[PDB]
Amino acid sequence: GSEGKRLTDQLRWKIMSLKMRIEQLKQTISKLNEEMK
Protein backbone atom coordinates (compact mmCIF):
# COMPACT_ATOMS: atom_id res chain seq x y z
CA GLY A 1 0.00 0.00 0.00
CA SER A 2 1.25 3.46 1.13
CA GLU A 3 4.77 4.82 1.73
CA GLY A 4 4.44 4.53 5.54
CA LYS A 5 3.02 1.05 5.62
CA ARG A 6 5.68 -0.15 3.18
CA LEU A 7 8.27 1.19 5.68
CA THR A 8 6.67 -0.55 8.67
CA ASP A 9 6.36 -3.78 6.78
CA GLN A 10 9.97 -3.70 5.67
CA LEU A 11 11.05 -3.18 9.24
CA ARG A 12 8.82 -6.03 10.42
CA TRP A 13 10.38 -8.24 7.74
CA LYS A 14 13.92 -7.46 8.72
CA ILE A 15 12.98 -8.30 12.30
CA MET A 16 11.46 -11.69 11.38
CA SER A 17 14.52 -12.56 9.16
CA LEU A 18 16.84 -11.59 11.99
CA LYS A 19 15.14 -13.88 14.51
CA MET A 20 15.30 -16.74 12.07
CA ARG A 21 19.02 -16.21 11.61
CA ILE A 22 19.56 -15.78 15.34
CA GLU A 23 17.78 -19.09 15.97
CA GLN A 24 19.92 -20.80 13.28
CA LEU A 25 23.11 -19.46 14.87
CA LYS A 26 22.19 -20.81 18.28
CA GLN A 27 21.54 -24.25 16.92
CA THR A 28 24.71 -24.17 14.92
CA ILE A 29 26.67 -23.13 18.00
CA SER A 30 25.13 -26.03 20.05
CA LYS A 31 25.89 -28.66 17.39
CA LEU A 32 29.45 -27.51 17.21
CA ASN A 33 29.85 -27.61 20.97
CA GLU A 34 28.34 -31.16 21.00
CA GLU A 35 30.89 -32.03 18.22
CA MET A 36 33.66 -30.60 20.41
CA LYS A 37 35.72 -33.08 22.55
Binding site: L7, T8, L11, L25
Partner: peptide, 28 residues
Protein backbone atom coordinates in the same frame (compact mmCIF):
# COMPACT_ATOMS: atom_id res chain seq x y z
CA UNK B 1 5.83 2.53 16.07
CA UNK B 2 8.59 2.78 13.47
CA UNK B 3 10.74 4.00 16.32
CA UNK B 4 9.84 0.93 18.42
CA UNK B 5 10.50 -1.42 15.52
CA UNK B 6 13.91 0.26 14.87
CA UNK B 7 14.84 -0.18 18.48
CA UNK B 8 13.94 -3.85 18.36
CA UNK B 9 15.91 -4.24 15.13
CA UNK B 10 18.99 -2.69 16.68
CA UNK B 11 18.79 -5.15 19.56
CA UNK B 12 18.51 -8.16 17.31
CA UNK B 13 21.37 -6.95 15.13
CA UNK B 14 23.53 -6.67 18.26
CA UNK B 15 22.49 -10.15 19.32
CA UNK B 16 23.25 -11.48 15.83
CA UNK B 17 26.68 -9.97 15.83
CA UNK B 18 27.44 -11.57 19.26
CA UNK B 19 26.37 -14.96 17.99
CA UNK B 20 28.47 -14.75 14.87
CA UNK B 21 31.40 -13.91 17.08
CA UNK B 22 30.57 -16.79 19.31
CA UNK B 23 30.56 -19.12 16.23
CA UNK B 24 33.93 -17.75 15.19
CA UNK B 25 35.27 -18.38 18.68
CA UNK B 26 34.41 -22.09 18.80
CA UNK B 27 36.96 -22.84 16.05
CA UNK B 28 39.67 -20.62 17.48
Amino acid sequence: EAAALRAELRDLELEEARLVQELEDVDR
